[PDB]
Amino acid sequence: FQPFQQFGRDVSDFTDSVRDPKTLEILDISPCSFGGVSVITPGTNTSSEVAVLYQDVNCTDVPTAIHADQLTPAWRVYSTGVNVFQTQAGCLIGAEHVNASYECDIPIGAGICASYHTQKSIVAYTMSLGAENSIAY
Amino acid sequence: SNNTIAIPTNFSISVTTEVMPVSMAKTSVDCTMYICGDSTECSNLLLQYGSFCTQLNRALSGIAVEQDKNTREVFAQVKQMYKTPAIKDFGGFNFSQILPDPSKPTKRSFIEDLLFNKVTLADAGFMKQYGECLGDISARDLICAQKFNGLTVLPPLLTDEMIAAYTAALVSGTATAGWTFGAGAALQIPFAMQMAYRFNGIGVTQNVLYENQKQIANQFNKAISQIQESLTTTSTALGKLQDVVNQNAQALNTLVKQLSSNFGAISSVLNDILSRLDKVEAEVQIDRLITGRLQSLQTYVTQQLIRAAEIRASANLAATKMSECVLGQSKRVDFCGKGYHLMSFPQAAPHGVVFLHVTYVPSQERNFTTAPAICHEGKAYFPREGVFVSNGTSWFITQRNFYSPQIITTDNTFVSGNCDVVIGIINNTVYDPLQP
Amino acid sequence: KFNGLTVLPPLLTDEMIAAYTAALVSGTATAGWTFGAGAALQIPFAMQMAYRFNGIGVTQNVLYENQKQIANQFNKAISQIQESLTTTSTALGKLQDVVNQNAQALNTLVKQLSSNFGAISSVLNDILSRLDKVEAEVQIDRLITGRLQSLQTYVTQQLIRAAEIRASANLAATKMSECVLGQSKRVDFCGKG
Amino acid sequence: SNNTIAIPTNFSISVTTEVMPVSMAKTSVDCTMYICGDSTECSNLLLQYGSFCTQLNRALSGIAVEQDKNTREVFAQVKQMYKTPAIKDFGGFNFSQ
Ligand SMILES: *[C@@H]1O[C@H](CO)[C@@H](O[C@@H]2O[C@H](CO)[C@@H](O)[C@H](O)[C@H]2NC(C)=O)[C@H](O)[C@H]1NC(C)=O
Ligand SMILES: *[C@@H]1O[C@H](CO)[C@@H](O[C@@H]2O[C@H](CO)[C@@H](O)[C@H](O)[C@H]2NC(C)=O)[C@H](O)[C@H]1NC(C)=O
Ligand SMILES: *[C@@H]1O[C@H](CO)[C@@H](O[C@@H]2O[C@H](CO)[C@@H](O)[C@H](O)[C@H]2NC(C)=O)[C@H](O)[C@H]1NC(C)=O
Ligand SMILES: *[C@@H]1O[C@H](CO)[C@@H](O[C@@H]2O[C@H](CO)[C@@H](O)[C@H](O)[C@H]2NC(C)=O)[C@H](O)[C@H]1NC(C)=O
Ligand SMILES: *[C@@H]1O[C@H](CO)[C@@H](O)[C@H](O)[C@H]1NC(C)=O
Ligand SMILES: *[C@@H]1O[C@H](CO)[C@@H](O)[C@H](O)[C@H]1NC(C)=O
Ligand SMILES: *[C@@H]1O[C@H](CO)[C@@H](O)[C@H](O)[C@H]1NC(C)=O
Ligand SMILES: *[C@@H]1O[C@H](CO)[C@@H](O)[C@H](O)[C@H]1NC(C)=O
Ligand SMILES: *[C@@H]1O[C@H](CO)[C@@H](O)[C@H](O)[C@H]1NC(C)=O
Ligand SMILES: *[C@@H]1O[C@H](CO)[C@@H](O)[C@H](O)[C@H]1NC(C)=O
Ligand SMILES: *[C@@H]1O[C@H](CO)[C@@H](O)[C@H](O)[C@H]1NC(C)=O
């Protein structure tokens, strides 16, 4: 900061930094909601299970990109554990990764789809592009 | 002149590049985060504006899903992922530049590598990971301003390795199975014998390929090399794609900057009203920001719907050129590039497709005297195909698109009526192979 | 013009468009297909029509054996275009309504300046004459927001209409290539028959 | 009937007119003059709305340049300005009109 500047704003007039008036240190301000989150679901009335995609978050960072200490326990279940899967489009949690490719049911992105699939689970997989074939030229 | 005709004595194989946009950035907006900026008080006021945010998110979700349809319906036209053949030269035609190269891990062709280098993305890619915006003072960035205001780009469903996998399959089938690839299960054909069939599709006799095949292959190879030399040195060929990138970047940048507007409130900064005014009278100021910001956001969604319809119209056209130019041979003039269409090869490009149109171009035309009909013995003979032509001493039939003079036999011609009716009839002899 | 609305002239003046027309018909009259595929190759026009009859699947003789009838029918049919264009009032309706729509859009935009939008007056000088900044600015903002909203409407409508004109322009460009520079097998693309 | 066919014994040459729009009037708006007239006071308040005017002018400039594309891509398809032939009748076909 400049020696007399008290806060900083970006091109959006979002106040992104502030000088602490007591210590004179500079604090960054981040939005509470930061980043995109999207919920995978089959229909309600087929399962209440869901999976969560943290659209640009790194799977070890999910417990901090989400403020998992401030969340309810029922959400914090979706912050960690088994069934984390680092896709592109960020970390997917709550769907088990499966090595069989299938036609795309729910399009998650960056090559990944998910489906409610055989108990049943939400499973995530890479799309099959098509049938493998060769021409005996 | 009413009695002379120009026939091409030669031809050139031309390869022509057509660049088509197919998709745009799958933009997404957290409408509450944009308007009310995490403040709880404003969010209560935004509830009193009802369903506007839901309707805006629904619209942008339609745009996004449609971008995958556009990409799928262009590239995923072939259900069979015909793997790249081990040998890249067929009959002398060298496909090595448009097929993938196993010398690299990326399954792009060499041409596609140039295409993916020749366009620069405004973010260099969708990622700006969680920690990356909390940077130095110089590290302020319009992309971080976008994230802090709830604006994001979703990645496409098909990754570039998948688009390149489809184009590799399409060129592999085209290199090895011709038209049948579009009509059904791809049927193996020798490529020179496939090109011979495509010459008949022009109306050049099948021999003209085999009788010149080494020249034709050399011209094809050189033309593909001239594409590569242009795509390395050019700065403008993919402008139809870079300007789609630029337009969508600029639309988001103006949207975040529009948060700096006051819209007639005492301040552009929502915290600054809430800091400074009581709820009795802040709400009057907050409402001006809510309505103004919400108006700016609906402007963006409307123009995206406009731009998406334009891209979708372009994607439908690219999907038509894939079917008509790649999976077959098109009689539609200038549809599959200039010249008579022979073949097309699809190549992937960032948010687009590139068609290498291969066409026959007639060259070195020569003037000949010509006649509509021959009168042999009081009855008029017409060409079955082509035109009667005189080389100066002797009358022949030739095909129109390539000078190949043939003896005027009773096979090349059909007879109709006494030869008095046709104006410009001439008296040359018609040879009958039986009589000698 | 007083309110800042203007029409810019087209880049190609009508004499330049007419010059391209003249070249296109001249090539069609003298070189046929070759005009599209490459350097245009001279062909006698009766002999070009004979080829275009084969394109239908009518044997080449049927032209030469009837050429005077065909030429007369062609000439009369062109004359019937002239006689109808001299006497119709509606054949170009698809163009007159493109003129009318864009004129009407501008006329409603200037008339929208007569709106108050809930200000004390539609007239900006009248507010500024009558009120002090402390409270003029409230009234001025109601005019600014309403007027700026009226521009955003107009520009949206133009973007919609321009997309429609693209579709027609791309189609007309396709008919130039497929119908003028060639012969089309597409059943009903270049007119009936 | 399963065993009879109709064959045309004759034909008519037809000429048909298809009318197509290709461009529209290129339009330009001075967003400041439209909103504020000449009043300096209103122009200062309009600055507090920022880029709306710039964004509107950019949009209409896109329309305008696109109208020249539409005309060029229809008519300028041939690079050769083949001069009009001196004789307007070929084989009996009278191009003079
Ligand atoms: C068409 O023209 C090309 C050149 O414009 C001819 O190809 C050349 O032929 C000579 C003699 O065979 C070679 O020495 C050259 O290297 C060739 N160059 C190229 C670029 O092909 C070709 O022979 C002509 N075709 C016909 C049928 O006459
Ligand atoms: C096909 O074309 C290439 C030229 O593009 C020929 O040469 C190869 O070119 C690539 C780069 O383009 C190099 O990485 C290779 O090392 C080149 N190989 C050789 C032997 O020069 C290639 O040989 C051609 N293939 C055939 C079968 O003719
Ligand atoms: C098709 O019909 C037209 C008339 O509708 C025929 O033209 C007439 O032919 C007769 C005899 O040749 C002349 O007496 C008339 O004056 C012609 N009329 C016109 C308007 O040209 C024409 O011959 C018919 N076509 C065929 C192939 O039989
Ligand atoms: C071609 O058509 C015209 C009719 O439009 C024939 O007649 C001439 O037409 C123009 C107007 O288009 C008049 O100014 C001339 O005075 C007309 N001349 C005559 C002699 O009628 C014209 O003769 C036709 N040309 C040919 C070669 O047949
Ligand atoms: C008071 O302010 C001064 C100067 O900002 C700072 O050094 C100090 O730590 C603050 N608090 C106390 C208890 O002195
Ligand atoms: C986390 O991000 C780093 C780079 O910031 C990357 O190397 C790593 O792969 C990411 N996490 C995972 C699980 O891939
Ligand atoms: C999927 O395959 C990979 C192959 O490297 C393996 O590491 C992984 O354990 C497999 N997962 C399952 C669920 O089979
Ligand atoms: C064909 O004839 C015309 C007229 O004499 C002449 O101008 C032209 O150059 C000739 N073309 C060739 C290829 O001989
Ligand atoms: C015309 O073709 C015949 C082929 O038999 C040839 O003998 C003659 O020399 C040719 N004339 C010219 C002028 O090329
Ligand atoms: C061609 O034109 C000449 C005059 O240049 C004329 O004598 C001849 O009859 C015409 N023939 C044809 C078939 O047009
Ligand atoms: C063609 O032959 C007939 C009979 O020999 C003759 O009457 C006619 O004049 C000839 N025409 C030409 C152009 O030689």
Numbering used by the authors:
A (entry chain A): 552 to 669, 678 to 696
B (entry chain B): 697 to 1132
C (entry chain C): 843 to 1035
D (entry chain C): 697 to 793
Reported in the publication:
Many sequence differences between different SARS-CoV-2 variants and variant sublineages have been mapped to the spike protein (S protein), a homotrimeric glycosylated membrane fusion protein. We report the application of ancestral sequence reconstruction on coronavirus spike protein, resulting in stable and highly soluble ancestral scaffold antigens (AnSAs). Cryogenic electron microscopy (cryo-EM) structures with high local resolution indicate how an intricate network of hydrogen bonds between the RBD and N-terminal domain (NTD) maintains the AnSAs in a closed pre-fusion conformation.
In contrast, pure AnSA-5 and AnSA-6 could be obtained from Expi293F supernatants in yields that are comparable or slightly favourable to HexaPro. One dataset of each protein was collected in one session and readily yielded 3D reconstructions at an overall resolution of 2.59 and 2.77 Å for AnSA-5 and AnSA-6, respectively. The overall structures of AnSA-5 and AnSA-6 are similar to the S protein of SARS-CoV-2 (root-mean-square deviation (RMSD) of ca. 1.0 Å per monomer when superposed on PDB 6VXX26 for 522 (AnSA-5) and 529 (AnSA-6) pruned atom pairs, respectively), indicating a conserved overall structure that is maintained in the ancestral S proteins. Similarly, the protomer interface between RBD (monomer A), NTD (monomer B) and S2 helix/loop (monomer B) is stabilized by hydrogen bonds between sidechains of S815 (S2) and E273 (NTD) (A854 and E281 in SARS-CoV-2 S protein) as well as N274 (NTD) and Q534 (RBD) (N282 and L560 in SARS-CoV-2 S protein) (bottom right). While HexaPro showed a clear interaction with soluble ACE2 in an SPR experiment, no interaction could be observed between AnSA-5/6 and ACE2.
